Design a binder for this molecule. Structure first.
Ligand SMILES: NC(=O)c1ccc[n+]([C@@H]2O[C@H](COP(=O)([O-])OP(=O)(O)OC[C@H]3O[C@@H](n4cnc5c(N)ncnc54)[C@H](O)[C@@H]3O)[C@@H](O)[C@H]2O)c1
Ligand SMILES: NC(=O)c1ccc[n+]([C@@H]2O[C@H](COP(=O)([O-])OP(=O)(O)OC[C@H]3O[C@@H](n4cnc5c(N)ncnc54)[C@H](O)[C@@H]3O)[C@@H](O)[C@H]2O)c1
Ligand SMILES: NC(=O)c1ccc[n+]([C@@H]2O[C@H](COP(=O)([O-])OP(=O)(O)OC[C@H]3O[C@@H](n4cnc5c(N)ncnc54)[C@H](O)[C@@H]3O)[C@@H](O)[C@H]2O)c1
Ligand SMILES: NC(=O)c1ccc[n+]([C@@H]2O[C@H](COP(=O)([O-])OP(=O)(O)OC[C@H]3O[C@@H](n4cnc5c(N)ncnc54)[C@H](O)[C@@H]3O)[C@@H](O)[C@H]2O)c1
Ligand SMILES: O=C[C@H](O)COP(=O)(O)O
Ligand SMILES: O=C[C@H](O)COP(=O)(O)O
Lengths: 336, 333, 333, 333
């Protein structure tokens, strides 16, 4: 009848918790049987139940000394720093959803397979492996894949828009800036944050320039654009909800309307990628069930003779919206 | 001339006084006009959420402020024609209310006893000055002038240099900009601008600006060659402008930055930094604009080249420092 | 009965409609009056910075909103006496503008052909209702009624519960309160209240509230026995109230917590928690007040005892749940 | 003993150095220990989100900072017992990591060859010091001492004045407190304080503090007579403490305020205001506490009387000014 794959989550963080929320929301056939993090079940249960961005959890949440009990289903809880020591076989976890931020390579995520898992989907960029943005390149997946990435939230915002432009007009070259909600990689107060000096600064009190590979590594998702895009971010003080701008030279001359029509078609019957003509703002994207929502109000054609710059803008809930992509990619990946 | 009125003792109006005092200008602020009591303008001048305690004594009477022992009269006239500028002999008006941003509207100050007007904002087709870019275009004959937006003072110095070094054939800007008094505290009507109605401290808010569209008033060769907009975000002040240009020659990142370093050298209006700074590091800047070499980006594919150049600006104090520079000169011609 | 008009389609006005459709009220909102166009009101209704998108369809015409298929008139009359309520037979007016907070002012809606008025704010010495504290004082002869402030709906059930069980001999209240529309986005005049002139999202701002001073309107036996104020702080919504009381009885923490839990049992207005919640956990509460057992504190030396009790409340939606409970009762009398 | 080491070059550690140079102290900071490179510490000192550019020059080598042209050694030892303090002769350690908050734990600094420790936080039953309250208790043979929290530095001088003038029979404190490094940028594990795991800049978060409970260490006669806790809120620094006391005498507001004014006179640690300030007006304060006459409140029902007294504090820089006063005395015993 139905494919009932068994899933473990490594890192029950902002993304790891929303992975469970979303799986339950869509009545997915996957069963989350295990969770690994660095803390007790009490603390994970508190964090699951009460959420500063998405509000109370829509299901019952309890804990024992070794487990979460979520809508009456037990989920084992482990606390292993090192993934080779995670006992994934004890509850039969075959596809690990890897969200700790510390295993973003084939060699590192390998430890999940040494531990007895069968596959791993990485919730972040992970070098030169298969990297999937759903409804842009998920067809490249097949039965032989064992470690896969879904890139960043910014790649999931960028890829759909860039794909549509490429397919319709060509992109000669382009540059991206995402005005991006602050995340857990930043700092609450001015203090050391590894090697990235700017990341050390109080994230709710500054505009902080910040580097991102969403553009530079786009060719993993859209091969014909390898080397053609660059970009960065500015981290700003909103808790989630992000916007991505892109300034392109296209392969032909365009009008605003024409760009917008082409994107509209591309969003039609597309559960991953949305369209809006409304004068929305970042908080309106919070809880979005898209990876990306193209905003036709922000389209801008600048032109002098045959020279033409095209600016296109796309919103994304870098938290929940990404996660809806991650889950779509996970449902497909899990049944191969 | 050295007798000045401030109309609109707001964020910008109060800082104007602070900067004049700070640089010991031989300009005298003799009179102020807002919509409220001297007691409230005193509290506001004395206590600033962004820049701290006023660095001088502030006291009030029923009809005036006492600021470093100097009397400044305070009027509450909604309409500019009703302001008794003549009373204390106010010659040049610094227009910081937002309601008199045209030649015809700011004319009301002239009709009321003033000679010149300097508008703290874009003001249509009018002489519009970024200091150390086109301040040489001002003469004795000028009565009413503008110093554009803070965004224009960030963008213009950067644009001048790029144009002079390499030429800009076309370009589009985005300013990631601190929230201002034109936005809302809570979701609620704010004229026809739908986005401006949204809670400014809890949102990234796209917002129009003509800093790029009206750049031709400041840099005539760039007329019609630029476009842009803003993203208002939740910082109280401190902003940053990104320009993506197609230039007139091939360039390297080192090449772009050296030309900027050059243009910023002995330039009290336009600074340079190669440090990994952030918006709060720009608060209290004495520049109109600070080009940031660390964010320079060349995207090249063949013939085709895109060039991202980024400058910081304190949209409040920094802009003001440009406004005084422009004012001091305007008062002498 | 049945048919309702809203004056002031703001934070509270909009949420009134949302709570009404959420609970599938027989009450029918037939007209809305504000100062702006249907387009803007539609935009604001569709898109909410604190509760997300509106759960129903929202469209408009030049003179109306169309919400979940149902047409609702929009009027733009600044003086209540001119609102044409008789056109759609608006009987009960929900007064959420903040400009008609007295019997004298709100009776204008009656002059405009409404039958009753429910004011969403304190409004002097008139009937004043916190649901499930004193809604039993309502009768068929009440024509103008207040539901006080959000802060009042927070404090009252906490204080009733204390008064009944142990007695409050004297007390003082402090609410750490989300910022509102009455405060300032940037430093600038906000009437005569100096502190409210300061930037709401960048400051802790002391603020007066009448919630405790006027508590005798809801709990007569406490009249004149409480005082209090607010420290307005940078959260968009969600608030918390501390009451420090001298009781008429020696108590333990557990004893105080049992009495509160009993008072919250089967109480749709008044909730209980012993979880380590924070303000955003209350956003979207269906209660006027939620007592927090975790923060209860008994300080004693001999027979001198201080008791601190604390209650959360979503001063936007939580309060509105109370305003709608009051409204549906008002209309069946 | 003019030679000093800093452990924890964080928010407090770095401001400790800012302040010593601000007051031209003859204390000599010779070594710093933390967990990171001199590059990163130099950046953090140069550029500060709350207080802006360091007023003196800042460079670095692969094992040192160079501050105002003067060399400071930089170690990276996570266990204080391994810090080579004898290399450059650091005889007094200013312990600002938060991991050494007891005599047991800070004894390590003495094992590592230093002679005294001054802990920038509460640290159990040890000599704990609020400057201009109990710095008379410091003694030649004290080797490990505390300056408690900044909240203790806000509370204690207010309670001292009240105790001295009227007696405090019993009292309870609530501080409305800026967020700090012990909280979280996003929702996630934060040891075993559940509330501490919550986004600090998007929530009002209750949080325990022993300021009141451990006041007996600073004012022996108030031992056991106070309790309290904090509400952590989204402002970056700048905090306020409320205290509700039952006093030993019957009093008016003018009387309380006048007592407080007398205690603040010529007191470099304890300030006074009747101005209508807000939190950002305390950022940069050179007091440990500034008492605010405007929020004084007497609640009375015959015999019974509650007194609410409120004091501001810059939990970072203000506190630091007290830490430095105490350090300067300590080095001369
Ligand atoms: N905006 C976003 O938040 C966002 C969007 C897209 C992708 N991502 C990616 O997803 C991953 C997680 O992001 P996040 O914001 O949820 O981080 P987070 O800190 O919110 O969550 C990380 C979790 O992992 C745990 N952890 C840390 N090291 C661990 C280890 N060795 N083993 C097990 N658990 C460990 C932490 O306790 C925490 O609960 C990152 O790779 C990030 O780039 C984040
Ligand atoms: N804040 C910035 O970033 C910034 C930067 C550059 C330029 N400006 C420009 O300067 C002007 C003022 O900006 P702001 O941010 O200080 O605005 P603001 O809202 O802080 O201040 C406006 C002031 O003018 C007063 N006012 C309003 N109507 C008036 C009238 N009819 N007569 C007298 N006074 C009146 C208000 O009471 C207030 O004190 C605007 O045109 C704006 O575009 C602002
Ligand atoms: N936000 C809260 O926490 C809260 C909680 C409880 C009660 N209240 C009370 O509810 C009332 C409104 O609060 P709010 O936060 O919704 O205010 P708000 O400013 O969000 O909305 C007021 C609305 O009324 C409109 N308005 C102003 N003058 C008007 C007039 N003459 N005619 C018609 N409409 C007019 C405004 O345009 C706006 O849409 C106030 O009395 C307030 O005390 C507010
Ligand atoms: N910020 C305030 O409001 C405030 C006020 C008064 C007292 N304090 C106290 O002072 C101390 C520090 O507070 P803060 O806000 O500066 O914290 P912080 O996190 O900003 O500073 C801590 C510093 O210590 C370093 N550190 C951590 N572990 C270490 C170790 N094992 N060895 C050496 N260095 C280490 C960190 O890298 C960081 O630079 C705490 O005890 C705190 O209670 C803080
Ligand atoms: O305590 C007062 C109310 O809850 C909110 O008041 P306001 O919205 O009128 O400022
Ligand atoms: O009140 C200030 C305290 O001393 C600081 O507590 P903290 O350890 O959370 O910074």
């Amino acid at each position: 009848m139905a494919s009932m794959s068994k899933v473990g989550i490594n890192g029950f963080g902002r993304i790891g918790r929303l992975v469970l929320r979303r799986l339950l929301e869509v009545k997915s056939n996957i069963d989350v049987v295990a969770i690994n993090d660095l803390t007790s079940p009490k603390i994970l249960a508190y964090l699951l139940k009460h959420d500063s961005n998405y509000g109370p959890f829509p299901w019952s949440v309890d804990f024992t000394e070794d487990s979460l009990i979520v809508d009456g289903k037990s989920i084992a809880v482990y606390a292993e720093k090192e993934a080779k020591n995670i006992p994934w076989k004890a509850k039969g976890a075959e596809i690990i959803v890897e969200c700790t931020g510390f295993y973003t390579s084939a060699e590192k995520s390998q430890a999940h397979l040494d531990a007895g898992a069968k596959k791993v989907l990485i919730s972040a960029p992970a070098g030169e492996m298969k990297t999937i943005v759903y409804n842009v390149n998920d067809d490249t997946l097949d039965g032989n894949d064992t470690i896969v990435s879904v890139a960043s939230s910014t790649t999931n915002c960028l890829a759909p828009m860039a794909k549509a432009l490429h397919d319709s007009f060509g992109i000669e070259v382009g540059t991206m800036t995402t005005i991006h909600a602050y995340t857990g990689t930043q700092s609450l107060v001015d203090g050391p944050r590894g090697k990235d000096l700017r990341a050390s600064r109080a994230a709710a009190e500054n505009i902080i320039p910040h580097t991102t590979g969403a553009a530079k590594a786009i060719g993993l998702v859209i091969p014909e654009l390898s080397g053609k895009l660059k970009g960065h971010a500015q981290r700003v003080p909103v808790k989630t909800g992000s916007v991505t701008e892109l300034v392109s030279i296209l392969g032909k001359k365009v009008t605003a309307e024409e760009v917008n029509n082409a994107l509209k078609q591309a969003t039609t019957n597309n559960e991953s990628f949305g369209y809006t003509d409304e004068e929305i703002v970042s908080s309106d994207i919070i809880g979005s069930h898209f990876g990306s929502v193209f905003d036709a109000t922000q389209t801008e054609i600048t032109a002098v003779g045959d020279l033409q710059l095209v600016k296109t803008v796309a919103w994304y809930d870098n938290e929940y919206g990404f996660v809806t992509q991650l889950i779509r990619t996970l449902e497909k990946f899990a049944k191969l």
